[PDB]
Every structure is written in structure tokens, then in C-alpha cells.
């Protein structure tokens, strides 16, 4: 294929304009009118191109970091682990997980 492939893609709306757009403006109104009977919705595919840039790293960050106790005592009534969180830089933890 081409070294770009963008055109060879859009000719299937595989990653391109949404149906509301390429469909001739006349047809869009007709499909938005008769949608409660004889809907022309499930046949003109859209796209779904996901965000190429600035969403993921390239240089680090094991998904599931493993911190080990820097402390431990067996009181028979508790176990007081003292971890050391080291959330790095350009990096966030969202302490749910």
C-alpha cells in the first residue's frame, strides 16, 4: 500500500469523516427524520480513530510497580508494614489501584 494509506483508508470511512459529514446533506436529514421506523443508521460506518499523540509514553513506567516493605514487625495483634511510595515524574498514581 501507500506510505501514507490515509486516502486508501477514507474510501471505507475506516478512519476518516463521520457519517453525519460525508453523507450528502440531503440524506442526513432523511435518515434523522425516519429513524423511529426504517432507520438508515446501522449501515453507514463511522470511524473511531484513537488519539495518536500525547496519550502514552515511550521510555519507562512498568504498568504495575512493585513496592516492598521498608519495615515489618510481628506483634501477634497487627503487622505494621511501612512501604515507601515513589511515584515518579510525569507520572501519577491515582491511588485507587
Amino acid at each position: 500500500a501507500t506510505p501514507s494509506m490515509m486516502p486508501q483508508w477514507s474510501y471505507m470511512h475506516i478512519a476518516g469523516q463521520d457519517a453525519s459529514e460525508y453523507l450528502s446533506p440531503g440524506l442526513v436529514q432523511f435518515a434523522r427524520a425516519t429513524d423511529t421506523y426504517f432507520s438508515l443508521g446501522n449501515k453507514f460506518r463511522n470511524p473511531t480513530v484513537a488519539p495518536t499523540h500525547d496519550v502514552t509514553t515511550d521510555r519507562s513506567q512498568r504498568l504495575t510497580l512493585r513496592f516492598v516493605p521498608v519495615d515489618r514487625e510481628d506483634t501477634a495483634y497487627s503487622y505494621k508494614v511501612r512501604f515507601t511510595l515513589a511515584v515518579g515524574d510525569n507520572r501519577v498514581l491515582d491511588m485507587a489501584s
Partner: peptide, 6 residues
């Protein structure tokens, strides 16, 4: 900004 998909 600039991200999501559609």
C-alpha cells in the same frame, strides 16, 4: 488540548 477519538 487534542485527544479522544471520532
Amino acid at each position: 488540548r487534542p485527544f479522544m477519538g471520532t
